[PDB]
Amino acid sequence: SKFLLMDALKLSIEDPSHEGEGIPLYDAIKCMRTFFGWKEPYIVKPHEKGINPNYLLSWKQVLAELQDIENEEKIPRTKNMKKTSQLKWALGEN
Amino acid sequence: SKFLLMDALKLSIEDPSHEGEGIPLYDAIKCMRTFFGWKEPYIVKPHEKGINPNYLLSWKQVLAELQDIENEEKIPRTKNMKKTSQLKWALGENMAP
Amino acid sequence: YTYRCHRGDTQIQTRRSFELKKLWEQTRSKAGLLVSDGGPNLYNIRNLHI
Amino acid sequence: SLRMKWMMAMKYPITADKRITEMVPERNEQGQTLWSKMRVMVSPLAVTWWNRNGPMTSTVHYPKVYKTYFEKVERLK
């Protein structure tokens, strides 16, 4: 399937006010800020095909790029990732 | 006094999310959105020194510039007003000896 | 959803909300307002041909 | 239709004649724009504004040939 069914859990936002209409990116950021307990990631079940360090680096890059928005003076509406080696391999650009 | 005391009212955003810590500009915009009832402004007590149409134009410009945020690719953190004739007169930028 | 025309007594915020509110608070018989501008829906099985 | 739900999300998707300028103001009370210059492109807020406070004409020759529909309404009640 495209998305998993039984195994999903959610990070809720705890009852937004009735006047809250916004962009999905900032809703996602607000949902992410409500969680504590992140640690150093590691692989627990390999894929038997492909390169797994690329997956780990992709997840780390997502975290860093989401945390690296405060350096911009004109905060944007959509986020464009940077074209890196692991991401190019994952998306099959070559 | 700098700000009037007994004759002031408030436009409340009421409750913000307990985790909401944001820029004052967007708090002000959200407070503004919860009000309906604007009309066409007009003067009921002149200043008897100065030009009152400049005051009317300043209020209209503030309202329009606050509404015109959506014509921007990126959302700004602070708002800088245009240097207009009435604002220049109000701030006294052309009475410098 | 597609034409941004919700009812006058609703909390949904769009770009058309202000004028819909102004029209809603101005009218007296609110059942004669079209759906395209902040009105209720009176269609049922007996009315489908009108 | 996905085409219709792609141009209602952008400003000025409707066309009208130049006489709109002399009748509808450029901005409303809150400060929202209603039309733009380079026929001219207008916004649905212009339609709502006209329905709110615009010129009123009470001619009866407009529903002239519409009286066949009212018979159904009269028969339904």
From Swiss-Prot, chain A:
Cysteine pairs bridged by disulfides in the record: none
Processing and modification events after translation: Phosphorylated on serines and threonines by host kinases, including human casein kinase II.
Domain of life, source organism: Viruses
Compartment list: Host cytoplasm; Host nucleus
Family: Belongs to the influenza viruses PA family.
Subunit structure: Influenza RNA polymerase is composed of three subunits: PB1, PB2 and PA. Interacts (via C-terminus) with PB1 (via N-terminus).
Purpose: Plays an essential role in viral RNA transcription and replication by forming the heterotrimeric polymerase complex together with PB1 and PB2 subunits. The complex transcribes viral mRNAs by using a unique mechanism called cap-snatching. It consists in the hijacking and cleavage of host capped pre-mRNAs. These short capped RNAs are then used as primers for viral mRNAs. The PB2 subunit is responsible for the binding of the 5' cap of cellular pre-mRNAs which are subsequently cleaved after 10-13 nucleotides by the PA subunit that carries the endonuclease activity.
Name of this protein: Polymerase acidic protein
Residues of the full protein shown: 280 to 373 of 716
UniProtKB/Swiss-Prot annotation, chain C:
Subunit structure: Influenza RNA polymerase is composed of three subunits: PB1, PB2 and PA. Interacts (via N-terminus) with PA (via C-terminus). Interacts (via C-terminus) with PB2 (via N-terminus); this interaction is essential for transcription initiation.
Family that this chain belongs to: Belongs to the influenza viruses polymerase PB1 family.
First and last residues shown, out of full length: 557 to 606 of 757
Subcellular compartments: Host nucleus; Host cytoplasm
Function: RNA-dependent RNA polymerase which is responsible for replication and transcription of virus RNA segments. The transcription of viral mRNAs occurs by a unique mechanism called cap-snatching. 5' methylated caps of cellular mRNAs are cleaved after 10-13 nucleotides by PA. In turn, these short capped RNAs are used as primers by PB1 for transcription of viral mRNAs. During virus replication, PB1 initiates RNA synthesis and copy vRNA into complementary RNA (cRNA) which in turn serves as a template for the production of more vRNAs.
Coiled coil: none
Protein name listed in UniProt: RNA-directed RNA polymerase catalytic subunit
Disulfide bonds: none
Post-translation changes: Phosphorylated by host PRKCA.
Organism lineage string: Viruses, Riboviria, Orthornavirae, Negarnaviricota, Polyploviricotina
Curated annotation (Swiss-Prot), chain D:
Membrane-spanning ranges: none
Entry's localization field: Virion; Host nucleus; Host mitochondrion
Similarity comment: family membership: Belongs to the influenza viruses PB2 family.
Role description: Plays an essential role in transcription initiation and cap-stealing mechanism, in which cellular capped pre-mRNAs are used to generate primers for viral transcription. Recognizes and binds the 7-methylguanosine-containing cap of the target pre-RNA which is subsequently cleaved after 10-13 nucleotides by the viral protein PA. Plays a role in the initiation of the viral genome replication and modulates the activity of the ribonucleoprotein (RNP) complex.
Subunit organization: Influenza RNA polymerase is composed of three subunits: PB1, PB2 and PA. Interacts (via N-terminus) with PB1 (via C-terminus). Interacts with nucleoprotein NP (via N-terminus). Interacts (via N-terminus) with host MAVS (via N-terminus); this interaction inhibits host innate immune response.
Protein name: Polymerase basic protein 2
